[PDB]
Ligand binder design. Structure first.
Ligand SMILES: Nc1ncnc2c1ncn2[C@@H]1O[C@H](COP(=O)(O)OP(=O)(O)O)[C@@H](O)[C@H]1O
Ligand SMILES: Nc1ncnc2c1ncn2[C@@H]1O[C@H](COP(=O)(O)OP(=O)(O)O)[C@@H](O)[C@H]1O
Ligand SMILES: Nc1ncnc2c1ncn2[C@@H]1O[C@H](COP(=O)(O)OP(=O)(O)O)[C@@H](O)[C@H]1O
Ligand SMILES: Nc1ncnc2c1ncn2[C@@H]1O[C@H](COP(=O)(O)OP(=O)(O)O)[C@@H](O)[C@H]1O
Lengths: 494, 483, 489, 218
């Protein structure tokens, strides 16, 4: 089981909504410009906040599967659609015996608010199939995936304009490919956008370039947008920028490895890396390429030659930035006063308890919340869906056009200078620009789309925080920002 | 709350399936082979789909309210699904799942080609105005339609004791105006509709007439009656009805019409008794002017149920647990006719089997409304009332037959005219007569099917197990022969 | 039907009927509302019913056979959707207008309601004179008009089902169905139900050509067999010893004469556009039809002398023209006026007939047999089978088994002494069994429809104390039915 | 735009323009036809372009906030379908007429063609004075009018895309999109493209408020 399977995490998400809804309520009635009495206005605001909170639809399924040995098995599955204020719905599919209707409902609500902070036009959704994937062959997993897709499609729980699922830590790109293939072959055969019914697909099936590193890149951009803001950094007693900064990552998965790599690339020194099985530490620095290569040949980071065996988690290691990148409860009321980092970057869902949040606010520690920082994969999910709607890879028709314009601009500078100083002044691209031009592909535009989203959303969260004088309570600002946006869609629709 | 809201009634339905499935299992393999039979029985048992909804409603005072609702579709072996909608704070997902499964087996015993379904909206209708009940009904219809939980060929809802024909009219009107606007059969998305909206004639008494026909089919079978020590027919028979709603009143009026004497009538507030007989028209008129049957001049008051009154036929016509292990040995009736769902516990069933008391089960006896539901759905598909083009044709053929007999006899040797009863049948011929014949035929065919199933498995007076086995055999064959 | 005064008539008939039902509708309401709110609901619903809900005006191009282009103007009004699909004819005439198409659509709503045909009213008009176009150009106009209606929800088996008119026929209806089924309704299993009046080879129904005439007979028969209404007119029930006169010897007039004569009524006079004939001893319909088929006219008929004021019991205006006005209404000698066509009696003549105790059976009911059979054609196309196809042989065997049972029972009762008692069908029954086809079931459906609607109109007239004002009773009956659909929805 | 003389003006502008292009259009025809048949094609096509192809007149009920019912009269003309969808505003005014809606639809066809906007012209009018109605009643009118247009092919992302007017605004456009996406266009991924002039929170575009003024400058 994960932190996302924990019933206490579901109560947390509900509490974050309740806190945010009570803060926006008073300001929403003032901004209502409708020709109603003040009593009608408050009823409308409270009424809409009451509609937003619960999941609109939950589908429970029972479907048969014939095992490879010939015996039959009844599979139990569910999918919750929290909100339709934005269609289609969006959300992953978990294959786990630890799934429940309450999990699927809470994670669907979390997805609604996460999409709203990063301006992704989808309501939240979440599915769960109550099976342990380790107990099934690839053929049986395909049968389960294809039949589950069929039952969701017949009831409006999968479709390019209805609900677009995605993979999870328990599911992958091959299962997403089977979902799209089943939908396009049967229910969505007459739909030109049938392959946009699901994201996380392989590149050969309509997948998007830049999906594997989307979350890690989003964690970097999120830290970057706050670490370059001198107003927030002066409050933490630090200088802006990644230079002369130290960081520690708890969880060396795909998000842990990618964050570690991009922070290192910008001058930040990794002093410690934590894993499910022990931790490593080096105050002089840990190279991400050397550590990734070690883990790929030994299965673990334990025994890394250029680091010491640190006992337990690295949450209390002396660093500037702490990055919880694993889906588990890590920061609690007992270890929050022992945290030595000034910035806590949540690169996973729910690593900090509400009691730890309170301690961090008292200690002037900035927590960049999961609702914002863990939205990179969600942002590139949106771009994959758009790519399938577009029916073309990003930049396909404009890369060569841009390249010729760049050369024409450099030639114009060269000719103008030769004319001004008389007669050669060669104006050529740098080694880095030439490499960008030669290797120009879809991933560069997806990375750009993600960087712009994390930057625009960081400023939105900073503005929402300064409006309600929340200071370093970025989590409440992100929830208030999400609830304000969802409220306005319902209010202006009638 | 009702007996249909009780969690113990859900366990009962599950137990009836488990009992029936273990009995058919051995005979199904005869007709790797045991894996297919057990596998299909494992697929049949749980509900395939359950939809949970949360939808807003603006009250008449201006305030908003979030309404919680659900709809379960137990089976799609037959499409569309079919099942009522309950408006009650006592509804639950487990209720809606168990009642959907009950509807799959009930439809199968009466050869109604629908999978089972059931909906529930967690509200107390007494706390809402008619305008608010319309808002709830129309929004619930919209949310079901968008997810495949209402449609002429997908899922056809119906009313309940908590809902009526006005709500069904709103469902059909909302569906035909929005989601099903392009569907020629949009008005077939729901049954229990008023006549002005595509409803069928003969829907009001459908359940009551089904109870009468169900009883009549066993009461006129001398093989079953000799085992109970009785003569066939309703003549010289006595009966008692527990629950004087619409089913109890109709069943009382129909048995009386055929010679059976009503010795006792039970109600939620006390009961009345007269060994010489109670007239149904006199009792109905008394209740319509006083609100209760208490104080009826031609009967004596009794504080308690009539379940232990000396009679031949006992008719539990109210949806509540009445026959339990404590009062089952005190029952003096030889036939127990279940006019409501779940009035007898499994422990009482066992006592009745030991005492040679025949229990006509609810799965069969309470399927008259479900049968005429099928006919209303067919009427909306047909887009014409039953008999509209053939009544006059039949009348002319009958007159031509009588004229042929008259002419042949006058040639050989004489007015040949219809009887007063036949003339009245011809003159008053309307849709209700075809619906009544269709219901009587269904009840008669299903009774013989249940009798043959009971004789095939040597079940004797265990008609409930026979009805469940009959239903499971039919549902199994659809899955098995489809692949 | 092109006359603006006829549109004002239909509007006036609605206004008269709506004011009569208004008081009884509030009293019959069982809703949880105040009395002032219940009155607002009744007037509000009557205000919704009166005007046409939708009117579509079209402009579409046509390439003439000479190569030149022409812009054709057309319209279709759907008066009501309380019952879907809509139903109504298509007129090809330069005299069509939006007001015509709106008034005739409203008339069709009330006509469908009195005979329990579940369709809202509709009417289309294409502003062209069909005599100025070739068959190829008429096909082009028909197919393009069908396309423009289909794209806007003005034709479809479950949306709007058009029909022919006096200006249009079965070939045009066939082109409508063929255009719809080949393009917009290609994926519809019921595409051929998008229009009625089709030829038999295209899904048409048997019994369509004589539908109006059979309905005119059945409408008369249902009031003539009612002793209560006949005692008020000083007559005995039944067609025996009854005399009748028919004004207009077309398909309706001839058929009405043919069926009335078959039941004992004696035709004393027949009127035509060119003169009239008269014989108090009787005129044979078969002899008169054969004479007209070989001479083009009824003038010079040997068994008659060379008819609204003729002494008879039943007067049947069967031609679409103003015949009964305030000037000749006091000279009418008939006790029953059977309107076999639209608008033969003015409102002033209706008043005179009510004062003189003359029963006028209204066109809204009596001239609705064609509409009744149109519903059956639409049903036939939905059924995808002809009526009786699977049951004629079954019924025949049951009839023989019944006669055999009577024969065996009598031979058993009277013994061998006496002999065989053959029980065989009459010559008429044998002919019915041998020639059993769809038209016999369509004729049954029509007779039952007229019978049931006659009793409904009688009950409405008794409910509102209208007496012999059957026109107001038919309009009130139609408005009550349309109101109840809106109110209970 | 309510003035009958303005409608005659638009008709006169078309007649003037059509007579000028007529002579040059026959020369540019490269089809294998006779010169007389070439002129028949040009004049024939100009005769098709001039009138509105479709005009829908509606009568729909509305329950006022006081409980009383009111029958609302409305219309929508689609001048041309040479480019689909059609495009055009909705006016809420007691001064609207079928002739207004037809002339302004034709004006929109030619306006879209000069700015290479691929839409045919369209125009709607609802015969009501918005000042006499509450916001709740204006929402009821807007949602019911949307329903009646959608059922007859007079609103849809690929059929006819309405817009606001000086008498209507972004809240009404939001109600149109919400009604269409909830009922008739529920299965359409592009349901929110059924109308323009929407608020930003409902799919509106940035730069819409200053669009006419900027175009006047440009
Ligand atoms: N998931 C969402 N829920 C609610 N509102 C949203 C959501 N995503 C975006 N919005 C808001 O809807 C509006 C759409 O604006 P637009 O300019 O089209 O998109 P964006 O600026 O997000 O790229 C913005 O105000 C945006 O903040
Ligand atoms: N709800 C049901 N589930 C399973 N089988 C059914 C159901 N209803 C009917 N059947 C069976 O399906 C078959 C249909 O037979 P058919 O003669 O067409 O209909 P019926 O005899 O019931 O009028 C029969 O064997 C019938 O018993
Ligand atoms: N065109 C119509 N408009 C309104 N009500 C109608 C119309 N046609 C029929 N009705 C009524 O609707 C109801 C339908 O009853 P039903 O028994 O299904 O049909 P019918 O008896 O006409 O064959 C009847 O009360 C009938 O009078
Ligand atoms: N509303 C319209 N009606 C007719 N032709 C149009 C209309 N809008 C654009 N066109 C023409 O159609 C062609 C489309 O050309 P294209 O290059 O695809 O578009 P554009 O140049 O307008 O961006 C052009 O010749 C353009 O002038």
């Amino acid at each position: 089981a994960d932190r996302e399977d924990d019933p206490n995490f579901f109560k947390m998400v509900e509490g974050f909504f309740d806190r945010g809804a009570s803060i926006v309520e008073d300001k929403l009635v003032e901004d209502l410009k409708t020709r109603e009495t003040e009593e009608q206005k408050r009823n409308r605001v409270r009424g809409i906040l009451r509609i937003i909170k619960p999941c609109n639809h939950v589908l429970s399924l029972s479907f048969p599967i014939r095992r490879d040995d010939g015996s039959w098995e009844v599979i139990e599955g569910y999918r919750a659609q929290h909100s339709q204020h934005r269609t289609p719905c969006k959300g992953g599919i978990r294959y786990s015996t630890d799934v429940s209707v309450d999990e699927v409902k809470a994670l669907a609500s979390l997805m609604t608010y996460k999409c709203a902070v990063v301006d992704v036009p989808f309501g939240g959704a979440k599915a769960g199939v109550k099976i342990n994937p380790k107990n099934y062959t690839d053929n049986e997993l395909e049968k389960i995936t294809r039949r589950f897709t069929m039952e969701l499609a017949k009831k409006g729980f999968i479709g390019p304009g209805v609900d677009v699922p995605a993979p999870d830590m328990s599911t992958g790109e091959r299962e997403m490919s089977w979902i799209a293939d089943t939908y396009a072959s049967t229910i969505g055969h007459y739909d030109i956008n049938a392959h946009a019914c699901v994201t996380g697909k392989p590149i050969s099936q309509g997948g998007i370039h830049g999906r594997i590193s989307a979350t890690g890149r989003g964690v970097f951009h999120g830290i970057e947008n706050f670490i370059n803001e001198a107003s927030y950094m002066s409050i933490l007693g630090m200088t802006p920028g990644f230079g002369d900064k130290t960081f520690a990552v708890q969880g060396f998965g795909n998000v842990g490895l990618h964050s570690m790599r991009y922070l290192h690339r910008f001058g930040a020194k990794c002093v410690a890396v934590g894993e499910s099985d022990g931790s490593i530490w080096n105050p002089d620095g840990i190279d991400p390429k050397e550590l990734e290569d070690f883990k790929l040949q030994h299965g673990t980071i334990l025994g890394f030659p250029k680091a010491k065996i640190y006992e337990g988690s690295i949450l209390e290691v002396d660093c500037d930035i702490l990055i919880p990148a694993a889906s588990e409860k890590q920061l609690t009321k007992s270890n929050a006063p022992r945290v030595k980092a000034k910035i806590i970057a949540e690169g996973a869902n729910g690593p900090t308890t509400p009691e730890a949040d309170k301690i961090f606010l008292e200690r002037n520690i900035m927590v960049i919340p999961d609702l914002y920082l863990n939205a990179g994969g969600v942002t590139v999910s949106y771009f994959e869906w758009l790519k399938n709607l577009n029916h073309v890879s990003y930049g396909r028709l404009t890369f060569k056009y841009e390249r010729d314009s760049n050369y024409h601009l450099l030639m114009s500078v060269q000719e103008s200078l030769e004319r001004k100083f008389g007669k050669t002044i060669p104006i050529v691209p740098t080694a880095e620009f030439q490499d960008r031009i030669s290797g120009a592909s879809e991933k560069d535009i997806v990375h750009s789309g993600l960087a712009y989203t994390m930057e625009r959303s960081a400023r939105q969260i900073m503005r929402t925080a300064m409006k309600y004088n929340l200071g370093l309570d970025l989590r409440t600002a992100a929830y208030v920002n999400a609830i304000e946006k969802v409220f306005r869609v319902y209010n202006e629709a009638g």
